[PDB]
Every structure is written in structure tokens, then in C-alpha cells.
Design an enzyme around this catalytic site. Structure first.
Site, PDB file in Angstrom:
ATOM      1  N   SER A 220     -12.877  35.902 -24.477  1.00 42.25           N
ATOM      2  CA  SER A 220     -13.766  34.769 -24.702  1.00 42.25           C
ATOM      3  C   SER A 220     -13.171  33.825 -25.735  1.00 42.25           C
ATOM      4  O   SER A 220     -12.497  34.264 -26.667  1.00 42.25           O
ATOM      5  CB  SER A 220     -15.142  35.227 -25.177  1.00 42.25           C
ATOM      6  OG  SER A 220     -15.078  35.692 -26.506  1.00 42.25           O
TER       7      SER A 220
ATOM      8  N   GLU B  84     -18.914  28.917 -32.297  1.00 43.05           N
ATOM      9  CA  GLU B  84     -17.858  29.135 -31.305  1.00 43.05           C
ATOM     10  C   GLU B  84     -17.011  27.891 -31.021  1.00 43.05           C
ATOM     11  O   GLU B  84     -15.875  28.041 -30.567  1.00 43.05           O
ATOM     12  CB  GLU B  84     -18.441  29.687 -30.006  1.00 43.05           C
ATOM     13  CG  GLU B  84     -19.506  30.737 -30.255  1.00 43.05           C
ATOM     14  CD  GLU B  84     -19.707  31.708 -29.094  1.00 43.05           C
ATOM     15  OE1 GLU B  84     -20.069  32.881 -29.380  1.00 43.05           O
ATOM     16  OE2 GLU B  84     -19.513  31.308 -27.919  1.00 43.05           O
TER      17      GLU B  84
ATOM     18  N   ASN C 245     -19.288  29.464 -19.021  1.00 45.61           N
ATOM     19  CA  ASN C 245     -20.480  30.277 -18.802  1.00 45.61           C
ATOM     20  C   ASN C 245     -21.657  29.437 -18.319  1.00 45.61           C
ATOM     21  O   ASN C 245     -22.515  29.943 -17.600  1.00 45.61           O
ATOM     22  CB  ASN C 245     -20.849  31.041 -20.075  1.00 45.61           C
ATOM     23  CG  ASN C 245     -20.270  32.448 -20.094  1.00 45.61           C
ATOM     24  OD1 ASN C 245     -19.590  32.854 -19.160  1.00 45.61           O
ATOM     25  ND2 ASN C 245     -20.528  33.191 -21.167  1.00 45.61           N
TER      26      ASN C 245
ATOM     27  N   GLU D 276       4.987  32.155  -9.888  1.00 46.06           N
ATOM     28  CA  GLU D 276       4.553  31.163  -8.903  1.00 46.06           C
ATOM     29  C   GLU D 276       3.338  30.376  -9.385  1.00 46.06           C
ATOM     30  O   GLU D 276       3.192  29.201  -9.039  1.00 46.06           O
ATOM     31  CB  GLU D 276       4.247  31.825  -7.551  1.00 46.06           C
ATOM     32  CG  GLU D 276       5.469  32.399  -6.826  1.00 46.06           C
ATOM     33  CD  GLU D 276       5.294  32.529  -5.302  1.00 46.06           C
ATOM     34  OE1 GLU D 276       6.157  33.198  -4.676  1.00 46.06           O
ATOM     35  OE2 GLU D 276       4.333  31.959  -4.723  1.00 46.06           O
TER      36      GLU D 276
ATOM     37  N   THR E 278     -13.149  38.518 -32.157  1.00 47.00           N
ATOM     38  CA  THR E 278     -12.049  39.267 -31.560  1.00 47.00           C
ATOM     39  C   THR E 278     -11.415  38.470 -30.437  1.00 47.00           C
ATOM     40  O   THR E 278     -10.207  38.209 -30.456  1.00 47.00           O
ATOM     41  CB  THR E 278     -12.540  40.614 -31.024  1.00 47.00           C
ATOM     42  OG1 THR E 278     -13.270  41.311 -32.038  1.00 47.00           O
ATOM     43  CG2 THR E 278     -11.363  41.493 -30.546  1.00 47.00           C
TER      44      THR E 278
END
Ligand SMILES: Nc1nc2c(ncn2[C@@H]2O[C@H](COP(=O)(O)OP(=O)(O)OP(=O)(O)O)[C@@H](O)[C@H]2O)c(=O)[nH]1
Ligand SMILES: Nc1ncnc2c1ncn2[C@@H]1O[C@H](COP(=O)(O)OP(=O)(O)CP(=O)(O)O)[C@@H](O)[C@H]1O
Ligand SMILES: Nc1nc2c(ncn2[C@@H]2O[C@H](COP(=O)(O)OP(=O)(O)O)[C@@H](O)[C@H]2O)c(=O)[nH]1
Ligand SMILES: C#Cc1cnc2ccc(O[C@@H](OC)C(=O)NC(C)(C)/C=N/OC)cc2c1
Ligand SMILES: [Mg+2]
Ligand SMILES: [Mg+2]
Lengths: 254, 437, 421, 51
Positions: B140, B183, B206, B254, B145
Site C-alpha cells: 500500500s 497517507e 481503493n 516485456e 510498512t
């Protein structure tokens, strides 16, 4: 209660619209940079479309259509007409010149232009305001105010030419408004977008001495005629704002 | 045959890892105990599914995955789940206390204590690889973390595996689905630090996943299980070329080669159809033309944005199910006329199509109906910069007041890394702009 | 294992402390003997956050009981759940603190604090991963106020990296034990500015107004005030005590709630404050209503930096969301526009006992500045005339130290006014 | 509208349809610099708590 912001204070038109929204008591004005708004009267340049429709539990509407500059920049419009498989008999050759050499001339006096106001709502219904105005023919350069409204011009055409405004001019204007707006629709429609758009347009037309209508240009941020501000700005709230945010016809649908 | 190693970092990364490897096992006929009756190469094989699973002498097929979290409660569910039998314990690495939504805590403070251990467990997997392609990293943007320790791991993988490609699957933060107020900081910090170390990154908003869940599956309040099961369909479509016989996107090089002309602009937009509710008994089977047209509907995008107001640099259609080339060109012919598909001038206006005949697999009991044909479109369009514009705007609001900054500076980070990272993003936005308008 | 260590200090601290343990022991199925007698494992899944599991599968609060007089702690040992606390974790002296902050911080309490830190050390060392500390106390007397903030100073030294939260009862002249309460509260607030991560500001005036005006209690006791604090502390801690909630500990919560180090004093609220259960609109209206706030501050007098709210009971999540998004999207003027998405919400299926639905509210609002203005005015009114100071200079304190407490709280108050603009 | 580079097998086919042509030392220094700013800040705390 509906929330709306204001980001174009110079808007002659939308100053009257936010003015009416408050007078219903059901609309509350927020700060220009508060993002928890329902409706936005946005700015003319660099308006942040990529930040609309991401507020949880807000249906957001804006008074502009991203992508409509293609029609409203004089340069872009030429490019639009020339490279569109639709489109061409009503737009002057464009790249004596400027240029239409034989314009219909009002009498007495021996030249004019016609402004039509078109409103396109979130559903892409095309609404032509009933009242146009006849105005180099510009307030900048210049009947009371060199502005003649439709009933007089109709009366002139009847008595002078034996024809009406609808027949000789307005069938061509409706055909032109529909052709430009029908053409750019798949590029600008907000039908399945996470936010919604409407927009007021100012079409500028010329009439020649054969009663042919020509498109001059399309205005994206148009002013109005002082006499018609009341009528039209109320029609905006009715057809474009409250049709998405309902509370508790001056338009021809094309 | 070249192996691929998956790393899942933090809560979002581990849980999505769960949904993926459950889906991989059903597609590959591997049972939860790791046995695979289809594989008659007992204890071995150089088949295409061995890019993601290795074999033991006992016949068990073991994901080439590593799970990493700074606290134990999520990976502990893996350890005691349906697929507990699949993973070697060495593969599941947890710490004591988490990074508390603090990028500086996952990268600097806690991250420094665990990075050598992680690299050592990964190194174990790499050593079981005759040939190694690179890494797929799931995380995320918003966790401490997921954002912080990931960019430390990505820096070190560039050092320790310099020739290997790195692909990203990143969860972009949405206030609908449990964000924290900080965030936007973590997202910019991790994007700045990681941008030079990633070859191709697939962002999943999300907000997008959540709406597709409410609209198409008719789930009033979707859970992470709902979201992740939908996200692992998209992931599976993207990695299917690597796990199956095929000629398109058959190694990680690719992806960069097909989708990323400019290194920094390495975020393809993913679009997916059809997403059909499973409680919807009578449904009509959409055509090739229909599911392909759906790839140009903003509402099936992994990231909400309007590609009509951008330019494409590459596009790749990946079909699964009953699909033959004739129908795809049919469908494409029609959409060229009706849709706004502007390509950048220095690029061919074309589509790389890959067709996999096995139709999508779905979790029994899930909310996703079995369809006879689905597509995933991967397209590098400058429109995705809208997502950067939203994030950078939220960053600027908080940072102009230095709100929450003190939590980062208290972890040894310096205030100027905030502005180093945001200048990177101002540059990135300007790159998309130079390319796109 | 996300263990929390609880400390309660002095008369008020131990009385709201004892109630908090009655309330949450009921929710977790723990009887007054420590034996579990519940019906759902949801009750047991995070039981170790607040409870050690002793030898015969009894559960013992991880709770340290502290006072400089024996009298309130003999009361606890003799109340309903008296037997449930660990006997070693009662740490008390004999002298009292005489409602004197300097006796609590500097003379009497200094004698006793090493012995408390011994029990704290022993509870911490048995913690799988200690998540942080919480302290219950008043700010208006001497033990909880003066020794309470002495403990916090010492816990910081010994565990400089764990979170420290307090539930702090602020004095009000309308519910008053002695005149010196503003002196003790002012010296107490300066410590809390520097040495806690979160302080829940419980104004005793507001608690009294709520019992009097709203609950229709013509003569409220501390028992009635404390019943409100207990239900609020039980709400606040629901996301820590019950499974499936946000994967967040004290540090994660503190990070998201406190945008600036010194501005960490919170307004708690609760709804409802009867057999008709409230609809989700009724909860959301009462929760944000000024009358449901326990800091006696007007939120329409400042702006919310951040808000967190939990809803308990069986109710539509979508409906909680529409109402929450209706409250915000109607009064957007009272949330700062520069912390995007600063209102956070949760639902927990398990409602409080005796209730079908409830809402607990935690607001970091700049209106809280009104409470420190109130204490600062009471303080200066006496201090200009050095009234009642002899009680303090007799225990070794100097006038300079009062001036500095006064100056730091005036600072704090103007710091709030910087951000409400 | 051209269809180039068509490959088929038993699992499916792929092709292209063109519609129109055109270091460890540095990481160590940063991580340890951050650990020394943490440590310097915690020393100011303990100094202040000692005063
Ligand atoms: N789609 C999806 N998103 C998730 C999941 N878990 C968290 N998220 C999202 O990821 C963000 C929070 O990141 P986390 O993954 O929980 O954080 P973390 O990496 O574990 O790091 P910590 O701060 O230490 O806890 C939020 O934006 C969440 O909405 C998941 O299983 N699926
Ligand atoms: N081809 C043409 N033939 C005759 N007259 C023309 C003409 N093109 C422009 N005009 C004249 O120019 C006037 C308006 O010019 P034009 O519409 O192109 O610029 P503008 O000043 O209106 C920009 P805007 O409306 O956005 O403010 C008209 O009144 C008309 O008399
Ligand atoms: N809400 C509440 N306030 C209390 C209680 N006991 C005292 N107080 C208040 O706390 C202050 C007195 O401090 P107190 O706790 O009794 O003294 P201490 O033992 O020295 O710490 C005053 O402001 C009282 O109003 C109680 O049980 N509940
Ligand atoms: C002891 C202790 C303690 C300390 N500090 C807290 C901060 C916020 C908080 O909040 C809960 O209060 C209802 C809550 O439920 N919080 C949700 C909505 C899950 C997420 N909030 O994101 C900030 C609880 C806390 C409890
Ligand atoms: Mg976590
Ligand atoms: Mg007392």
C-alpha cells in the site's frame, strides 16, 4: 441543504446564479477552496477537473465541460471543423479577408451579428434560450445600446422581407448549434463520469444578404444582456442545477 | 524457464498476497496442501507454472513468495489459514510492533532492524532459481510498512539484484476505504524514494475497486476480502502470461518493453471487464465487442481518471476465455470510430493483444460470477497523472501547516526530505504534461 | 500482544479508575472474582490488552493503584470488583497530599514514587509487547495531580518511547473541593503539554451540567459524574478491546489524531446520555451536539483538527456513513480545510450493556482553548495577590515556578488561537 | 488496419494490431544518519529530564 463554492468572481452570469441559490434557503455557499461542495462555479483557466468526484458521498457538478475549449478557441474551432468527418456549408473559409463581403444590412442605416445562448445540461440535453440579441459590431467599439432583441428583428423581417425570424434564420441557427455540440459530445460528455458537467455557451452568427446564417465563433464564458439576466440565470438554476439537486419553458430543446 | 519471486509488504500487501495465491492455486489445480495431481513431473519440472511455484520431492508446490509485516497479526492469519500448508515458515517474516502509519518509522527506525533478515530470506528463494527474472512487490502507498519498508527493500534489491526487473502492485489510498489522515505524506515519500528502482508499477485506487464492488457486485459496504478478491482477478490477468504457455508478456522485461517508453512514466492504467455479481442468476454473456468497449469506460478503471483527456503511449489487451483474434479486431475497428483514443505522435496507434483460452477462475462462494470471457486492458495513458494531482494537492494542504511532520522528524527523518520528495512529484506531473498536451 | 498498562492516582483517579474496570470487565465477561463467564469469544480475543491471565485462568487487570492516603483504596478493595485487582499493585502512603500539588510532586509523593515505578516495571516486563500507558486522575487536588504528573515524568525517563495517555478531570468552581484547584491544574497542564501523547479533558463542570440539565438529576454526586466518565472511557477504548476493528495501536491512533506535538488535549463526547433506542441520525446529532461534550467548550467557537467516532450496536454502516457525511458536509466551516478527510468513524457490533446503540466521540478541537482560558483566569485572580501561595512555598516551591506555569499555559492558549485562524 | 506477429499455441494466441504509424555505502550513510538524529533527540530529552 446543498453546498456550492465560487471560483470565478468576474463571472457576470454566475454572480446572479449564486445570488439565486442563496435566496432559496436550501443552498449554502462555502469557501472557494473548501472541497466538500456539491456544485462548483469554477474558474475559466486551469480549472482542476481531475480533483472532482472523489469526495465520499458527494454528488459534484461543475458549470464547465472539460474538452469544450476545442469549440471555443477560434484557432481550435477551425481545426475541429476541418478534421471532423461531420462538417461544410455554414462556416466561412478559415485558416477580402479577416471575411463575408455581402452582409444583410439593417434599414434604416445600411451590419450586425446575432448572439444565441445555449445551455447544455449534465444529460447533454441542448437548450437554446428563447431570447437572442442582435448587436465590427461590438459594445467595445460602439436601438438602445445597438442591441435589438428578437421580437423587433422578427417584426422587421416580416415588414421588410415578408419572412419570419424562425423560417429565414433560426432553423439555420438550431441546425448549427446542434451540429457543433453533437460533434464534440463523445469527447466531453460526463454521462458515465464520476462528476457531472453543464455549461452556458454564447454562439455568434452572421447573416448574409441571401438570408444565409454563418457561424462566427463560440464563447465559453459568455456575458448576457442586462434585460435577460433575470430570465436566463433563473432558467440555469431550473434546468442545470436543480435538475441534479432538486429543491422542495424559456428554452427550446434541440 | 525463469523464476519470479513475489514479495508482499505490510497489511495490504499480505492480504492481497493471500487473495492472489488462493487464485493461482485454483487456476493451476494445486490444492491447499500444495499437491498438484496435474503435475506428473514429480519433484520437478521446467513448466511455466514453475515460474511461480517450486516443487519438493514430496510433490508439494510451494509459492516463490515472501511475506513481510512489521507486526504479526496479519501474517499470523496466513500461518493458520486454508493455505497454511503451502508456505515454508521461513517465508513468513513478522516483527514486533508496526510503523504506525509513519513512513519514517517503516523506512528508518524499524526498517533498519529487519532489512538484512528479509534480504536473507529472499536470498534463500533466489538461490533455488536456475534463472531469476526479478520481483513482484505488493504493498500500500499508505501504510507505514507498505510505504516505508518497501522503499528500503526496493533500494536494496537494486543493489543486491541489479540486473533483475522489479514490478509493483500498489494500493493507492482512498478515504472511502479506511485511510489515515497522513497517507498523502507516505504516498509521496514512498513514490519519490522508489521511482528509480521500479520498472513498472500498477496502481490500484481503493476508491475505484470500492465503487466497482458497490455498483457491479451490489455489495453495500465492501470488505477487504471483497476488494482483494476483485484486485486478485486483475493481478491474475496481468501475471497469467508468466504462468501459462503464451507469447505475450512472457517475462517481466516485456512489461517495461511493451508498456513503458519513458522510465519515469511507468504506471500503466488497468481496466477490467466484466465484473458480474454471482447472486445475479440470469445474466447475459457479454460479447468480445462488449467487454472490449468496456475497457474505455472510466468506471471499470483501477484508477478513476478520464483517458479521453490524455494521450496513450502503449495499450495491451489481455483476454481470457472464449475469444478469437477475428472478434478482437472487429471490436477494435468499431471502437476506433466511437472513442477518443489519442496516441502520442512518436508512437504507433496500435494494440498488443494476448488471448488466454482458459476463462477466468473465481473463488467458489465469492461474489464474482464465472464469465465465459473477460479482458484486462493495460494502457500507459497520461490521464493517470490526475491521481498524482489529487495526492500532491492533499500533501500541499497539510504540509503548508507542517501538520503531522513532527512524527516523522521524531523518527530521524529530516523536514527537507518532504520537499525533496514533493519536488520529484512536481517534476513527474510536468513530465506527464510535456508528453500529454 | 498490545498490552496496555493502567495507572490510577488519587481520590478521583482511583474512583473513575474503579468504574472503568467495572464497566469493561462486564463487557469482557469477567466476574468480580476474575473468572470469565461470557458467551462469545469476541469477548476474549483482545482480553490480554487490559488483563493478565493469572494461574487458574482468572484474569487480573493490568492496573496499578496509587494514592498517598489509604482511604480511597480501602474503598476500592471493598467495592463490587475490589477482589479483582492484584494485591501487590495497591501502592499507597499514609500522609496524604492535602490537595497540594507541591506535596504530590515534590515532597510526599517523591517518597512514594519509586515504589510505584517498581510495580510498573514488573507489569511492563511481563508484557509481550507493551503498547503504552494510560493514567486516570484529577488535576485539581494533590496526589493524582502533582504525584500523577511526577509519575509520568518518571515513566518517560524509563520508557521514553512508549505512548502515554491520560484521562484528566479538570476542576470547575461549580464542583469544587478547595480554592487552590486552579493552582494545581495550571501546574499540572504544563507537565501534560510536554509529557503525554493524548489527554482526554473531562471538565467537571460539563459532567455536572449533563447530569443536571440533561439527565434531570437535581443533586448529582461524584458517583453520577463518574458514571459518565466510565461509559466514555469504555467507548474510547472499544477499538482496542474488540476484534475486527482497525489494525491500530496507541501509536497509530496518536499519530492520526495529533497534528502538532503540544496540541493533544481532546474533547470526549457520548450519546445517548430509556427504552426507545436512538436511530443513527439521533446518535450523530447528539454526539456532535454541544450538550453531549464533556469539556464544557463550544465547538462552534473553534475548529476541529481531527475527529474520531465509534458507533456500537447493530446498525447500518452505510447509514452511519451518510449521517456522518451529512454532519460534516453541513457544517464544513467547523473542520479545518487543510487536513483532508480528518473525520474517522467505526462501527462495533457489540453495544454497551443496558443500551441498544451508542456513539462515542473524540474531538481534537481548537475550542478546548476555552478551558485553559478558564483555568488561567481563576489562576491569575488569586496569583496577582499571591493568595494561598504559602501552602506551596512551605513545601519548597518558589513564585518563579508559578509564573512559568502561567506563562506556558497562556502560550498554549494562544497556540490554539493560531490554528483556529 | 494490420495484424502482425501472430503466435498460436494450445493455450491461446497473441498478435499485434497496428491501426496507424507515428549504492550500499550511500544507503548505509542515510540510514545511520537518521539513527543518529533519533539518538541525539533522545539525549536532549534525557538531559532535559535530568535538569
Ligand atoms: N485493497 C486493500 N487495501 C488495504 C488492505 N489493508 C490496508 N489497506 C489499505 O492500505 C492503507 C493502509 O496501509 P496498511 O497496509 O494497512 O499499512 P501497513 O503497511 O501494514 O503499515 P503499518 O502502518 O505499519 O501498519 C489504507 O489505504 C488501506 O485502505 C487490504 O487488505 N486491501
Ligand atoms: N468573416 C466575417 N465577416 C464579417 N464580419 C465579421 C467576420 N468575422 C468577424 N466579423 C465581425 O467581428 C465581430 C466579432 O468578431 P469575433 O467574434 O471574431 O471576435 P470577438 O471579439 O467577438 C471574441 P469574443 O466574443 O470571445 O469576445 C462581429 O461583430 C463581426 O461584425
Ligand atoms: N469527576 C470526579 N471528580 C472528582 C472525584 N473526586 C475528586 N474529584 C475532583 O478532583 C479534584 C480533587 O482532587 P482529588 O482526586 O480528590 O485529590 P487527590 O487525591 O489529591 O488526587 C476536584 O476538582 C474534585 O472536583 C470523582 O470521584 N469524580
Ligand atoms: C487508550 C486509549 C486511546 C488513546 N487514543 C485514542 C485515539 C483515538 C481513538 O479512537 C477511537 O475512538 C472512538 C476509535 O474508534 N477510533 C477509530 C474510529 C477506530 C479510528 N480513529 O482514527 C483516529 C481511541 C483512542 C483510545
Ligand atoms: Mg499494519
Ligand atoms: Mg479530594
Amino acid at each position: 441543504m446543498y453546498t456550492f463554492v465560487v471560483r470565478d468572481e468576474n463571472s457576470s452570469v454566475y454572480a446572479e446564479v449564486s445570488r439565486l441559490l442563496l435566496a432559496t434557503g436550501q443552498w449554502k455557499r462555502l469557501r472557494k477552496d473548501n472541497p466538500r461542495f456539491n456544485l462548483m462555479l469554477g474558474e475559466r483557466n486551469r480549472l482542476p477537473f481531475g480533483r472532482l468526484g472523489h469526495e465520499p458521498g458527494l454528488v459534484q457538478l461543475v458549470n464547465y465541460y472539460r474538452g469544450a475549449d476545442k469549440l471555443c478557441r477560434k484557432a481550435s474551432l477551425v481545426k475541429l471543423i476541418k478534421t471532423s468527418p461531420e462538417l461544410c456549408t455554414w462556416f466561412p473559409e478559415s485558416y477580402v479577408w479577416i471575411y463575408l463581403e455581402k452582409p444583410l444590412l439593417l434599414e434604416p442605416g445600411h451590419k450586425f451579428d446575432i448572439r444565441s445562448w445555449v445551455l447544455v445540461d449534465h444529460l447533454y440535453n441542448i437548450y437554446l434560450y428563447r431570447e437572442g440579441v442582435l448587436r465590427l459590431t461590438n459594445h467595445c467599439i460602439q436601438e438602445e445600446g445597438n442591441e435589438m432583441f428578437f421580437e423587433e428583428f422578427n417584426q422587421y423581417l416580416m415588414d421588410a422581407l415578408n419572412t419570419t425570424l424562425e423560417n429565414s434564420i433560426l432553423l439555420q441557427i438550431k441546425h448549427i448549434i446542434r451540429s457543433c455540440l453533437m460533434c464534440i459530445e463523445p469527447a466531453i460528455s460526463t454521462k458515465h463520469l464520476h462528476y457531472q458537467s453543464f455549461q452556458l455557451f454564447g454562439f455568434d452568427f452572421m447573416v448574409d444578404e441571401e438570408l444565409k446564417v454563418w457561424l462566427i465563433e463560440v464563447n465559453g464564458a459568455p456575458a448576457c444582456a442586462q434585460k435577460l439576466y433575470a430570465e436566463l440565470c433563473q432558467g440555469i438554476v431550473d434546468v442545470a442545477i436543480s435538475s441534479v439537486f432538486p429543491l422542495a419553458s424559456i428554452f427550446i430543446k434541440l | 524457464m525463469r523464476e519470479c519471486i513475489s514479495i508482499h509488504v505490510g497489511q495490504a500487501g499480505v492480504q492481497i498476497g493471500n487473495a492472489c495465491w488462493e487464485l493461482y492455486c485454483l487456476e493451476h489445480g494445486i490444492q491447499p496442501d500444495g499437491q498438484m495431481p496435474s503435475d506428473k513431473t514429480i519433484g520437478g519440472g521446467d513448466d511455466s507454472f514453475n515460474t511461480f511455484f517450486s516443487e519438493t520431492g514430496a510433490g508439494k508446490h510451494v509459492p516463490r513468495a515472501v511475506f513481510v509485516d512489521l507486526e504479526p497479526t496479519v501474517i499470523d492469519e496466513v500461518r493458520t489459514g486454508t493455505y497454511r500448508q503451502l508456505f515454508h515458515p521461513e517465508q513468513l517474516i513478522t516483527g514486533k510492533e508496526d510503523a504506525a502509519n509513519n513512513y519514517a518509522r517503516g523506512h528508518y527506525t524499524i526498517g533498519k532492524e529487519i532489512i538484512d533478515l528479509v534480504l536473507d530470506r529472499i536470498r534463500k528463494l533466489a538461490d533455488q532459481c536456475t534463472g531469476l527474472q526479478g520481483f513482484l512487490v505488493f504493498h500500500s502507498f499508505g501504510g507505514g510498512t507498505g510505504s516505508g519498508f518497501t522503499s528500503l527493500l526496493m533500494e536494496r534489491l537494486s543493489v543486491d539484484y541489479g540486473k533483475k526487473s522489479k514490478l509493483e502492485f500498489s494500493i493507492y489510498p482512498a478515504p472511502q476505504v479506511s485511510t489515515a489522515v497522513v497517507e498523502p505524506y507516505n504516498s509521496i515519500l514512498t513514490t519519490h524514494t522508489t521511482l528509480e528502482h521500479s520498472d513498472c508499477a500498477f496502481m490500484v485506487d481503493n476508491e475505484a475497486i470500492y465503487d466497482i464492488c458497490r455498483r457491479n457486485l451490489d455489495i453495500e459496504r465492501p470488505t477487504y476480502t471483497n476488494l482483494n478478491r476483485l484486485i486478485s482477478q486483475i493481478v491474475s490477468s496481468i501475471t497469467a502470461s508468466l504462468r501459462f504457455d503464451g507469447a505475450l508478456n512472457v517475462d517481466l522485461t516485456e512489461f517495461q518493453t511493451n508498456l513503458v517508453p519513458y522510465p519515469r512514466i511507468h504506471f500503466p492504467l488497468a481496466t477490467y471487464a466484466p465484473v458480474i455479481s454471482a447472486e445475479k442468476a440470469y445474466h447475459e454473456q457479454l460479447s468480445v465487442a462488449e467487454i472490449t468497449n468496456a475497457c474505455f469506460e472510466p468506471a471499470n478503471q483501477m484508477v478513476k481518471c478520464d483517458p479521453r483527456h490524455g494521450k496513450y503511449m502503449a495499450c495491451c489487451l489481455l483476454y481470457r476465455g472464449d475469444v478469437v483474434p477475428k472478434d478482437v479486431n472487429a471490436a477494435i475497428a468499431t471502437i476506433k470510430t466511437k472513442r477518443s483514443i489519442q496516441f502520442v505522435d512518436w508512437c504507433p496507434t496500435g494494440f498488443k493483444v494476448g488471448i488466454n483460452y482458459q476463462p477466468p477462475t473465481v473463488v467458489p462462494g465469492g461474489d464474482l460470477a464465472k464469465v465465459q470471457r473477460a479482458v484486462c486492458m493495460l494502457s500507459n495513458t497520461t490521464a493517470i497523472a490526475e491521481a498524482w494531482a489529487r495526492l500532491d494537492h492533499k500533501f500541499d494542504l497539510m504540509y503548508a501547516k507542517r501538520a503531522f511532520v513532527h512524527w516523522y522528524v521524531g523518527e530521524g527523518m529530516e523536514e527537507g526530505e518532504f520537499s525533496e520528495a514533493r519536488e520529484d512529484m512536481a517534476a513527474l506531473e510536468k513530465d506527464y504534461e510535456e508528453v500529454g498536451v | 500482544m498490545r498490552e496496555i498498562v493502567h495507572i490510577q492516582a488519587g481520590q478521583c483517579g482511583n474512583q473513575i479508575g474503579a468504574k472503568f474496570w467495572e464497566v469493561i470487565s462486564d463487557e469482557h465477561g469477567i466476574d468480580p472474582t476474575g473468572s470469565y463467564h461470557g458467551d462469545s469469544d469476541l469477548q476474549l480475543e483482545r482480553i490480554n490488552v487490559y488483563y493478565n491471565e493469572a494461574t487458574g485462568n482468572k484474569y487480573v487487570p493490568r492496573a496499578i493503584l496509587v494514592d498517598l492516603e489509604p482511604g480511597t483504596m480501602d474503598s476500592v478493595r471493598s467495592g463490587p470488583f475490589g477482589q479483582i485487582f492484584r494485591p501487590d499493585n495497591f501502592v499507597f502512603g499514609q500522609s496524604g497530599a492535602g490537595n497540594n500539588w507541591a506535596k504530590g510532586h515534590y515532597t510526599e509523593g517523591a517518597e512514594l514514587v519509586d515504589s510505584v515505578l517498581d510495580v510498573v516495571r514488573k507489569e511492563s516486563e511481563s508484557c509481550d509487547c507493551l503498547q503504552g500507558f494510560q493514567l486516570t486522575h484529577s488535576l485539581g487536588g494533590g496526589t493524582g495531580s502533582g504525584m500523577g504528573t511526577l509519575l509520568i515524568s518518571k515513566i518517560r525517563e524509563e520508557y521514553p518511547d512508549r505512548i502515554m495517555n491520560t484521562f484528566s478531570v479538570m476542576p470547575s468552581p461549580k464542583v469544587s473541593d478547595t480554592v487552590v484547584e486552579p493552582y494545581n491544574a495550571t501546574l499540572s497542564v504544563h507537565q501534560l503539554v510536554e509529557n503525554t501523547d493524548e489527554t482526554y479533558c473531562i471538565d467537571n463542570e460539563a459532567l455536572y451540567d449533563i447530569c443536571f440539565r440533561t439527565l434531570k438529576l437535581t443533586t448529582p454526586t461524584y458517583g453520577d459524574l463518574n458514571h459518565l466518565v466510565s461509559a466514555t472511557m469504555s467507548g474510547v477504548t472499544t477499538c482496542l478491546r474488540f476484534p475486527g476493528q482497525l489494525n491500530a495501536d496507541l501509536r497509530k491512533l496518536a499519530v492520526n489524531m495529533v497534528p502538532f506535538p503540544r496540541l493533544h488535549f481532546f474533547m470526549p463526547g457520548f450519546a445517548p446520555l430509556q427504552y426507545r433506542a436512538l436511530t443513527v441520525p439521533e446518535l450523530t446529532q447528539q454526539m456532535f451536539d454541544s450538550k453531549n461534550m464533556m469539556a464544557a467548550c463550544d465547538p462552534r467557537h473553534g475548529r476541529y483538527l481531527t475527529v474520531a467516532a465509534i458507533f456500537r450496536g447493530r446498525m447500518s454502516m452505510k447509514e452511519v456513513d451518510e449521517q456522518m457525511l451529512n454532519v460534516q458536509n453541513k457544517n464544513s466551516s467547523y473542520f479545518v480545510e487543510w487536513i483532508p478527510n480528518n473525520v474517522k468513524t467505526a462501527v462495533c457490533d457489540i453495544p454497551p450493556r443496558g443500551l441498544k446503540m451508542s456513539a462515542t466521540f473524540i474531538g481534537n478541537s481548537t475550542a478546548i482553548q476555552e478551558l485553559f482560558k478558564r483555568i488561567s483566569e481563576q489562576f491569575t485572580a488569586m496569583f496577582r495577590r499571591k493568595a494561598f501561595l504559602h501552602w506551596y512555598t512551605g513545601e519548597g516551591m518558589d513564585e518563579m515556578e508559578f509564573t512559568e506555569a502561567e506563562s506556558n499555559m497562556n502560550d498554549l492558549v494562544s497556540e490554539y488561537q493560531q490554528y483556529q485562524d | 488496419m494490420e495484424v502482425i506477429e501472430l503466435n498460436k499455441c494450445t493455450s491461446g494466441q497473441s498478435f499485434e494490431v497496428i491501426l496507424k504509424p507515428p549504492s550500499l555505502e550511500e544507503i548505509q550513510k542515510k540510514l545511520e544518519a537518521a539513527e543518529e538524529r533519533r539518538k541525539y533527540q533522545e539525549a536532549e530529552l534525557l538531559k532535559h529530564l535530568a535538569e
